[PDB]
Design a protein around this ligand. Structure first.
Ligand SMILES: CO[C@@H]1[C@H](O)[C@H](n2cnc3c(=O)nc(N)[nH]c32)O[C@H]1COP(=O)(O)OP(=O)(O)OP(=O)(O)O
Ligand SMILES: [Mg+2]
Ligand SMILES: [Zn+2]
Ligand SMILES: [Zn+2]
Ligand SMILES: [Zn+2]
Ligand SMILES: [Zn+2]
Ligand SMILES: [Zn+2]
Ligand SMILES: [Zn+2]
Lengths: 98, 87, 67, 49, 479, 115, 8, 44, 576, 82, 93, 45, 257
RNA sequence: UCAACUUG
């Protein structure tokens, strides 16, 4: 029930405690077009609040060259706060340091 | 309907007198019962008082024949055992 | 999903030509040569056969809802 | 038995893993479907990074 | 070369891989303005096409599938890995950048009605409705059955003839708005028989039932999903966009006779205003039209990888010159109405145009004396609930600026929440009033004579009562 | 949902007149003809033939709105000629032209085949 | 996108 | 009241308030069969 | 809590009292319609059928309302309800007894909205007073609201998925208020800037420039067709400008018939040479500029944004000031119709042929860029040798950036000027820029010659990586390409590094738009709330609700902002 | 106030014209007698416009000065803003 | 210039610079309901109740809240019926 | 409860939310639908 | 004040194409004839479909649309047939319609291509231009399509399914001599196939006296009608429209006076 | 009621 609830609701935590829960994770997959499905699967979400209008986290940064698509970002109140991976980008799964 | 139609020309704001609250409230003796349901649906002296307002969109409140439209609702009073600061 | 009858812009019947176009492509004709042989001359008609994607075969792969 | 873990589709532990496209068609699942989403309560949910 | 760096340690596989999935479908992205590539990234997500090949099996809400998807005539090499050819979203369209009748002005688009008749940009909209027969109630059972007006005390006057014995409408039956897709009945506890619990079609769906399924859900209760299919022929409100950020509605639809025609007889499927191009600087659109003309004549799908250096506009123009057309792609057009050659030569070429999900039928709403909210006794909100449009505070400020005091009064009081209250003259607090009894009395004064009727919005009455509950007394005195 | 039926473009609904002739008060010997359920096809031919007439001072056709189906034709003739007469004569001339064209096209067909 | 004095 | 079965495509008549299980396969996903009344489709 | 309910937005105080959801309102997508007049709006039939305006039965209108009642809800020009004298409402949909259908004086029949019903048209956000204007209704057979293109400029609406709200007044009193205060023709001129709000736009402006050229000559039949769409025509064909050899009218001759009444106006075309006024041929202009209208006849000049646009002294502004609002409404509509029907003969287009320039021009652009890059290199070498001297008030880094930006900007502008020289008369980009319908000289320059320097946060592209903009460039590279200068044009295509830098600039643009919307909304609301109650009393003093005198006369001269015009005193400047 | 010493503008304000025409039209719709002979005018608002042109509307406008006094200008006395 | 001068005059009318904020606007001695519509809301109402403030009902927002006709244009004046003119003229209906 | 029709069944309506006498069309009740608006676990709490 | 006498020369006449040149005619008449080709030549096409069983992947309305677009031979019967509105009988009868019936089921493992040949008509004259074949739908094993359809007379103004022509090519003044289109650069533009100029000269010298004449046509057919019959029927139909106008105009003229 | 996702 914990795993199922956190996936279904979109709140990352427990049912009793929503104070530390992070909303926006686990959205419903968009099936309007195959392009929308693929882009929804390969999506990054910056944690900076949308309500804040400070422009530094939104601007495209030089280090996003080849890691994140420069053009593809939502236009509106979330410009630059939602990003899509480039075609060749591969996020590291992780390994032991031993 | 017999009352003449008038337009408010001045609104006077003031703190409600406790005596005025007692007189104005249709509920008498206060809300003695936390439960909202007695005799099945209505709890006299409870949170859902038939005299306080119209319920179920078909009933009529005791004070007036509101029929869910005419009645503006009527206030009730709870007599606190010991006084409490208003925030 | 399936080759459209009657090319949209002009209206020439192009729905009878899809299997012939595929066969000519198998015969190692270039796509332009196949379109020329089929009689498609205006670029509006050639657009229909050249850009068509036959998804109905992929749909036919699935087993029928009622046998 | 200590519980159930939701399974991301077409991962290694899903039933669809290592199935030929014909077999995916036999299960009425599209060969071109990317995978990577959980089916929780009947709706496909995607974990945004 | 002239020495810049002699210590390169790594090399890029290809610069076009910096772009993402949605930006990779843009042809000639480097020839566009940057905000336009950003806008096309968003519009491509909303285009219509076969979303997945197993769409017949799936029962999803709001699924649109185009009749005749086509792969782009001018395609990026990276599109192959996105499988855009396998599952395309859009149709190559003969597009003329011209001003014909003024119905393509702003961003609107004149479309060919004959082409629309021949299947151009036709789509299907499937909507699925789910209902669960819940027996969890102690004495409430939501049985699936066909409600009967005489048997059921609670019922509605919408059409119930469609429902079969199981309470589920059979597939293949047309359903108009306000019809009963699924009939469900809750047995009513006899406190001392039936409150209707059927589900009704969304207004103006006007579709035919496609599939009806009956299963048991996770909870084990009987679960029924019904999918309704509606064909959607393009109209004069639907939104069409190209791959270069040019979005617009359909201004008007002219038949093939009325559309301008080349000497060959080709009439543009879509006419877009020339005024869109210059300010937006989407030259990629123009180069795609040129490459599409060359590709349709040559028979090979054009290459539009972002950074090629082997494809230039001059080379495309020479290639087109070989095939008998003007090198820059312009063509001499004839006016459909009169037959006279248009003095300016119009730029006509095939261009991949998409159809977005936003359609006028889903976005049209009208409200007149509909249902009102419980809390505020104000009109509901939303198209589904027949809600009225909000008259915002900025709107009321505009009306104040006009000086239209009575329109402002009607819109903010009489149209929304008219109401009457009885107020004691001696004390501003409202007084109890029995209209049927014709006895009006005020508590706290023991005064019956001095009561006056006051007309106020119900929201204002609620505000004053909420102030009273906070011990504030908003004594409204007529004097 | 609000789309007009296709047959509305060319079918007169009951109680509608194909031609209504209303005189023009502004200028002498001018009439304004309104043709219902017709399009540029008929209007352009009639206007052209009217312009060919030496006694026709003004001749033009207007579709008031493309969504609606109506032609308004304004004909102004010299004195000793009537706008209605000009309209009738224009229609007769167009019919004669089309009939002669049909005969010659049939002859050309017969000559092209087996000749 | 033009210059420093223009627009971005 | 004839339900086609998803798994084995065999029609099974089910009475009201009867479990939704197809005989000969046991599958619980049934589809209602196409209605007998016919709808006129304009080719347009 | 009670305080929580009242305090926040969407609470009773603001979300349910100051603004609230209303009945008799409709919303749908807006699409263009050149044939509709300025005041008319095209309403779909379904929206018109749902919305009903109650009409009192009078002896005058009892027959018409009786026919509407007989038609019922199903037939479109029908009545949804009958309201009796007692207040009883007879819904005609459910069967009414034939006795009930009978009407007598005092009954109120709720007829369906018909052609000519005044409505209020709104598009959020409602920034200014012109965003809510009263439109007459014309029912047309599709499901989109259709408004004239000139009315788009007040609403700031384009037909790319926009939507608008339709409010139908329900009483004769409020209908009259809209008719006589808020109709579109009455609000052509804004009091904000004493300029006309609405002007000829898009195809009609571009085509009016071409129509008004000296070159345009129209034969007899084309004149017939153009005059057919002129609503105010006297029925008299103007005498052709060229009687022999073949009778040929001129574009200005026909446009003179459109001009209302007798309006006198002198304006200058956009391409007016500065030296022309001083030199000879000042009145016989060689380029056919210096629009002059005498006695409501276009003597000379090429119309453009300046003459027919939304600027003070425009032909439309002088029409509203002199002729009145009604004749000006007819003026707008007639310009649109006649010019749009001429555009079928002439036509407009945008193609790659417009973007491409002569080979010599391309070589000149390339040479300018070459010498600019060399100059930037020389500045860099001076800076490295420390020969550069700091500008007063600026650090050496700041002054180096200043000089480098100056060199790059001069090169950018010079290449743009060369590209603009290359443009022919037939070039359509030039047609749209010269007419003012859309675009700018900058856009042509970027299309043809050089995209320009990409600046983020007021500087060249910053060193996101350690001391270099992108991994491909060498550390400590302050050169032109490294810091963002995009040498290639849009037609030529951006190199990949230039593509990324261009994306950075465009992202800054998008972010600025998103931020400005919210901040400006807050400012606007605060100003309105502070000054909402201030008004001109019958003393003509400007007083607030408290009756405190803000101003003794409005504007210190007691005049309204729309009537005033710019004028020159002419006693001030001259010498004694 | 007295009929003499009227300080307000003789011209009818735009808001006064709007409200007078609307109110008179509402009266005409309720079968009030019409002073001006109608030439086949059925719409109440148009008849009200005709009456306003003839200056026969039977309404006197009471203008409230900010000091609390009022000046009663009949519609005939006011010069039409048109 | 009229629109700029009016804002400047409202800000500096009182003699102290009145910011267009909750503080400056609400401090001015307007009606309590009008203050309630702008920002502070409930707190303004509580203070007004405590001090026995009375709303003059001359403001536009206050009249809009209670559903009465605003004192704005088309509400500044009150029309009266002219009996003598009603008698005169041709009363056709 | 149509006043002119003793013992008349009033048909419900969804468009305006009112019960209407079907034989005369009189609207009895103007806007009397509005919105029209776990007991198993435990009891009243 | 009288009609010009036109002439016609037929340069090419094939089974699907007619090229002819109309001379001594006004531009308005020629363009109207071109317009009548597209929108006012009557043809028989399917307009009513009742689908009994449709197990194909394409939905029912998809099949109906594709069936409508299928051309049907209407060479001689279209003149005899009456419009459904004209016929006195309720719905459809053999005088006002032609009945087509289609029954196909795939029992073989191989995919069955439902083609226009599977459409069966009760009337021999109207056949789906078969005497490859147009593919209506492809059927997997166990999938069945059975439908019944009626075909009605109509013209392209109603729907593009009744459009007799594929492409009507209209061109006048092949070498720009009336300067109806002003080329910015005359040399770049390709010469017309009908152009009579030498290669050196791009445009003919301007002729102020000249007016549009000698209009060039190229009419291609979908097989519904013979390409010659399209032209002849268009001329006859335009003549009928003008005659109906003349009758109604005479009625109005007499009634007013 | 809350959340997210779009549309300007
Ligand atoms: C032109 O200004 C409009 C308006 O100001 C209104 N609007 C839009 N979004 C918002 C928002 O979030 N908040 C508020 N308050 N208003 C908003 O939309 C603005 C423009 O936006 P755009 O720049 O995308 O218009 P294209 O230039 O893109 O037009 P294409 O070529 O697609 O038709
Ligand atoms: Mg827009
Ligand atoms: Zn009560
Ligand atoms: Zn074609
Ligand atoms: Zn009291
Ligand atoms: Zn089974
Ligand atoms: Zn009754
Ligand atoms: Zn028959």
């Amino acid at each position: 029930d914990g795993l199922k609830y956190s996936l279904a609701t979109g709140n990352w935590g427990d049912q009793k405690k929503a104070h530390q829960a992070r909303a926006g994770v686990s959205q419903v997959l968009n099936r309007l077009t195959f392009a929308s499905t693929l882009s929804h699967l390969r999506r990054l979400n910056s944690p900076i609040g949308r309500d804040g209008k400070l422009a530094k986290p939104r601007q495209l940064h030089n280090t996003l060259w080849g890691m994140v698509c420069p053009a593809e970002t939502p236009e509106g109140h979330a410009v630059g706060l939602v990003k899509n991976l480039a075609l060749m980008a591969y996020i590291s799964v992780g390994s032991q340091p031993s | 309907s017999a009352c003449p139609l008038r337009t408010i020309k001045r609104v006077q704001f003031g703190v409600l007198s406790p005596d005025e609250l007692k007189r104005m409230s249709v509920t008498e003796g206060g809300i003695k019962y936390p439960e909202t349901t007695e005799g099945g649906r209505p709890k006299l002296g409870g949170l859902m008082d038939p005299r306080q307002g119209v319920i179920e969109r078909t009933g009529r409140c005791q004070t007036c024949a509101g029929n869910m439209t005419e009645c503006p609702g009527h206030f009730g009073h709870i007599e606190l055992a010991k006084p409490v600061f208003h925030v | 999903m399936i080759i459209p009858v009657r090319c949209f812009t002009c209206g020439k019947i192009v729905g009878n030509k899809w299997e012939a176009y595929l066969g000519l492509l198998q015969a190692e004709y270039t796509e332009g040569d196949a379109l020329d042989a089929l009689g498609l001359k205006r670029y509006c008609c050639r657009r229909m056969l050249l850009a068509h994607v036959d998804l109905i075969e992929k749909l036919l792969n699935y087993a029928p809802l009622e046998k | 038995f200590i519980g159930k873990i939701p399974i991301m589709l077409r991962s290694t532990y899903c039933l669809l893993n290592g199935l030929t496209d014909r077999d995916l068609c036999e299960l009425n699942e599209c060969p071109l479907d990317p995978g990577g989403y959980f089916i929780i309560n009947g709706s496909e949910k995607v974990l945004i990074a | 070369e002239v020495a810049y760096c002699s210590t390169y340690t790594h090399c890029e596989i290809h610069p076009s891989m910096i772009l993402g999935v949605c930006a990779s479908i843009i042809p000639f992205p480097d020839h566009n303005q940057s905000p336009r590539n950003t806008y096309q990234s968003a519009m491509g997500k909303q285009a219509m096409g076969v979303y997945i090949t197993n769409f017949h099996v799936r029962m999803d809400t709001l699924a649109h599938v185009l009749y005749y998807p086509q792969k782009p005539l001018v395609t990026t090499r990276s599109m192959e890995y996105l499988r855009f050819r396998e599952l395309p979203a859009g149709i190559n369209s003969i597009v003329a950048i011209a001003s014909y009748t003024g119905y393509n002005q702003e961003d609107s688009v004149i479309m060919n009605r004959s082409a629309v008749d021949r299947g151009f940009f036709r789509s299907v909209f499937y909507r699925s409705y789910k209902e669960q027969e819940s027996k969890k109630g102690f004495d409430q059972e939501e049985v699936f059955e066909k409600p009967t007006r005489e048997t059921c005390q609670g019922m509605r006057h919408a059409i119930y003839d469609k429902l079969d014995d199981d309470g589920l409408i059979a597939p293949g039956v047309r359903v108009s708005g306000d019809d009963v897709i699924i009939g469900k009945t809750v047995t009513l506890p006899e406190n001392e028989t039936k409150r209707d619990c059927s589900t009704f079609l969304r207004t103006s769906e006007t579709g035919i039932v496609d599939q009806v399924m009956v299963t048991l859900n996770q909870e084990g209760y009987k679960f029924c999903k019904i999918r309704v299919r509606s064909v959607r022929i393009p109209q004069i409100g639907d939104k069409f966009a190209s791959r270069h950020g040019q979005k617009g509605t359909c201004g008007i639809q002219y038949r093939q006779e009325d559309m301008p025609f080349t000497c060959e007889g080709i009439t543009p499927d879509i006419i877009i205003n020339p005024h869109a191009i210059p300010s937006r600087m989407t030259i990629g659109h123009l180069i795609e039209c040129l490459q599409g003309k060359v590709s349709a004549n040559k028979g090979e799908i054009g290459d539009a990888t972002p950074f090629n250096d082997a494809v230039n506009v001059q080379k495309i123009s020479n290639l087109l010159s070989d095939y008998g057309y003007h090198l820059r792609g312009n063509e001499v057009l004839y006016n459909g109405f009169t037959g006279r050659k248009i003095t300016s030569q119009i730029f006509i070429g095939p261009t991949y145009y998409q159809r977005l999900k936003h359609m006028v039928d889903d976005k049209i709403h009208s409200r007149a004396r509909g249902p009102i909210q419980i809390l505020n006794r104000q009109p509901m909100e939303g198209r589904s609930r027949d809600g009225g449009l909000r008259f915002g505070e900025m709107e009321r400020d505009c009306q104040i600026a006009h000086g239209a005091a009575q329109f402002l009064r009607e819109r903010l009081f009489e149209a929304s929440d008219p109401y009457q209250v009885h107020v004691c003259n001696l004390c501003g607090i409202m007084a109890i009033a029995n209209t049927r009894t014709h006895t009006y009395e005020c508590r706290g004064c023991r005064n019956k004579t001095q009561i006056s009727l006051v007309r106020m919005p119900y929201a204002c009455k609620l505000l004053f009562q909420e102030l009273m509950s906070m011990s504030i007394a908003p004594r409204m005195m007529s004097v | 949902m609000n789309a007009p039926p296709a047959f509305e473009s060319f079918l007169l609904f009951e109680g509608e007149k194909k031609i209504t002739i209303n005189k023009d008060t502004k200028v002498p010997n001018a009439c304004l003809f309104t043709i219902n359920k017709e399009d540029h096809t008929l209007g352009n031919i009639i206007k052209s033939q009217l312009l060919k007439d030496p006694q026709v001072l003004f001749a033009g056709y207007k579709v008031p709105h493309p969504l609606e189906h109506k032609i308004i034709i304004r004909v102004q003739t010299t004195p000793d000629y009537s706008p209605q007469e000009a309209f009738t004569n224009a229609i007769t001339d167009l019919i004669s032209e089309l009939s002669l064209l049909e005969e010659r096209f049939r002859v050309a067909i017969k000559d092209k085949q087996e000749g | 996108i033009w210059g420093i004095g223009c627009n971005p | 009241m004839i339900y086609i079965c998803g798994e084995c495509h065999t029609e099974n008549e089910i009475k009201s308030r009867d479990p939704i299980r197809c005989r000969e396969c046991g599958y619980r996903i049934m589809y209602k069969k196409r209605t007998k009344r016919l709808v006129v489709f304009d080719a347009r | 809590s009670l305080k929580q309910r009242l305090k926040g937005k969407e609470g009773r105080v603001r979300g349910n009292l100051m603004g609230k959801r209303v009945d008799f309102s409709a919303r749908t997508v807006i699409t263009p319609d050149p044939n509709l007049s300025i005041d008319q709006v095209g309403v779909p039939r379904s929206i018109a059928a749902n919305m009903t305006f109650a009409e009192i039965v009078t002896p005058f209108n009892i027959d018409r309302l009786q026919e509407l009642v007989r038609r019922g809800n199903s037939q479109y020009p029908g009545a949804k309800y009958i309201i009796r004298d007692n207040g009883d409402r007879i819904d005609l949909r459910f069967h009414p007894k034939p006795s009930d259908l009978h009407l007598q004086t005092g009954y109120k029949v709720e007829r369906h909205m018909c052609d000519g019903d005044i409505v209020i048209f709104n598009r959020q956000p409602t920034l200014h007073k012109m965003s809510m204007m009263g439109h007459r209704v014309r029912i047309l057979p599709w499901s989109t609201f259709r408004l004239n293109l000139s009315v788009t400029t007040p609403y700031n609406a384009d037909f790319d998925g926009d939507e608008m709200n339709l409010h139908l007044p329900q009483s004769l009193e409020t209908r009259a208020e809209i008719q006589e205060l808020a109709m579109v023709p009455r609000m052509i001129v804004t009091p904000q800037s004493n300029r006309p709000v609405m002007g000829i736009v898009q195809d009609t402006l571009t085509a009016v420039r071409k129509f008004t050229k000296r070159d345009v000559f129209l034969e007899r039949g084309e004149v017939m067709n153009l005059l057919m769409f002129l609503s105010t025509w006297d029925g008299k064909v103007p005498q052709p400008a060229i009687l022999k050899p073949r009778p040929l009218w001129t574009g200005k001759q026909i446009f003179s018939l459109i001009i209302p009444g007798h309006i006198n106006c002198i304006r200058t075309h956009s391409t007016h040479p500065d030296d022309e006024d001083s030199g000879p041929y000042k009145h016989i202009s060689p380029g056919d500029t210096k629009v002059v209208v005498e006695n409501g006849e276009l003597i000379m000049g090429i119309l453009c944004k300046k003459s027919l646009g939304t600027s003070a002294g425009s032909l439309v502004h002088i029409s509203y000031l002199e002729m009145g609002h009604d004749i000006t409404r007819l003026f707008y509509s007639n310009i649109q119709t006649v010019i749009n029907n001429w555009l079928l003969i002439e036509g407009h287009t945008i193609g790659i042929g417009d973007s491409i320039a002569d080979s010599k021009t391309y070589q000149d652009i390339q040479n300018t860029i070459k010498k600019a890059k060399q100059d930037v290199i020389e500045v860099i070498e001076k800076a490295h040798n420390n020969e550069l001297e700091p500008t007063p008030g600026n650090t050496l880094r700041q002054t180096f950036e200043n000089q480098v930006n100056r060199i790059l900007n001069d090169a950018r502008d010079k290449t743009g000027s060369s590209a603009q020289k290359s443009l022919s008369e037939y070039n359509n980009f030039k047609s749209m820029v010269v007419s003012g319908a859309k675009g700018s000289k900058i856009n042509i320059s970027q299309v043809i010659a050089v995209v320009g320097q990409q600046n983020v946060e007021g500087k060249r592209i910053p060193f996101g990586f350690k001391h270099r903009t992108l991994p491909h460039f060498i550390k400590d590279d302050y050169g032109p390409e490294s810091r963002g200068f995009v040498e290639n044009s849009y037609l030529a295509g951006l190199t990949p590094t230039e593509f990324f830098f261009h994306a950075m600039g465009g992202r800054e643009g998008l972010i600025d738009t998103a931020v400005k919307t919210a901040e400006t909304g807050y400012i606007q609301r605060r100003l309105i709330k502070s000054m909402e109650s201030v008004m001109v009393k019958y003393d003509a003093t400007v007083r607030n609700s408290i009756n405190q005198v803000v101003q003794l006369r409005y504007g210190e001269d007691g005049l309204a902002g729309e009537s005033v015009e710019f004028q020159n005193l002419a006693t001030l400047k001259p010498s004694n | 106030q007295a009929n003499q010493k009227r300080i307000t503008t003789p011209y009818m304000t735009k808001y006064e014209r709007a409200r007078v025409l609307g109110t008179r039209a509402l009266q005409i719709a309720m079968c009030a007698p019409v002073m001006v002979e109608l030439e086949g005018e059925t719409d109440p608002l148009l008849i009200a416009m005709k009456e306003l042109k003839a200056r026969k509307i039977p309404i006197i406008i009471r203008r409230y000065l900010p000091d609390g006094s009022y000046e009663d200008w009949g519609v005939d006395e006011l010069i039409i803003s048109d | 210039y009229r629109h700029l001068a009016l804002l400047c005059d409202t800000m500096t009318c009182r003699g102290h610079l009145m910011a267009i904020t909750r503080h400056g606007v609400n401090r001015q001695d307007t009606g309590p309901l009008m203050k309630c519509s702008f920002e502070e809301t409930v707190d303004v109402l509580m203070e007004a109740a405590a001090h026995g403030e009375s709303d003059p009902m001359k403001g536009v927002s206050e009249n809009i809240m209670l559903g009465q006709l605003a004192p704005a244009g088309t509400g500044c004046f009150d029309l009266l019926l002219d009996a003598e003119k009603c008698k005169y003229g041709m009363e056709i209906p | 409860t149509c006043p002119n029709h003793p013992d008349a069944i009033l048909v419900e309506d969804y468009r305006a939310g009112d019960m209407i006498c079907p034989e005369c069309g009189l609207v009895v009740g103007d806007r009397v639908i509005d919105v029209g608006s776990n007991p198993l676990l435990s009891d009243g709490d | 004040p009288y009609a010009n006498q036109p002439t016609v020369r037929i340069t090419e006449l094939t089974d699907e194409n007619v090229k002819f040149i109309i001379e001594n005619t006004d531009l308005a008449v020629a363009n109207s004839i071109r317009r009548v080709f597209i929108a006012e030549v009557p043809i028989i096409a399917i307009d009513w479909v009742q689908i009994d069983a449709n197990s194909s992947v394409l939905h029912d309305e998809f099949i109906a649309h594709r069936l409508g677009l299928i051309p049907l031979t209407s060479d001689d019967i279209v003149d005899k047939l009456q419009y459904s509105r004209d016929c006195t009988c309720e719905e459809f009868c053999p005088e006002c319609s032609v009945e087509f019936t289609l029954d196909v089921r795939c029992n073989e493992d191989q995919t069955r291509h439902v083609t226009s040949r599977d459409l069966i008509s009760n009337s021999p004259r109207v056949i789906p231009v078969t005497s490859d074949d147009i593919l209506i739908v492809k059927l997997r094993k166990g999938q069945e399509l059975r439908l019944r359809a009626y075909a009605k007379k109509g013209f392209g103004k109603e729907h593009a399914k009744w459009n007799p022509t594929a492409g009507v090519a209209f061109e006048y003044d092949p070498d720009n001599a009336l300067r109806h289109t002003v080329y910015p650069k005359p040399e770049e533009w390709p010469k017309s196939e009908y152009s009579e100029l030498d290669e050196d000269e791009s445009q003919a010298p301007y002729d102020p006296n000249g007016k549009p004449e000698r209009f060039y046509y190229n009419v291609e057919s979908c097989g519904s009608l013979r390409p010659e019959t399209i032209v002849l029927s268009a001329l006859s139909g335009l003549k009928k429209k003008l005659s109906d106008l003349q009758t109604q105009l005479s009625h109005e003229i007499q009634s007013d006076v």
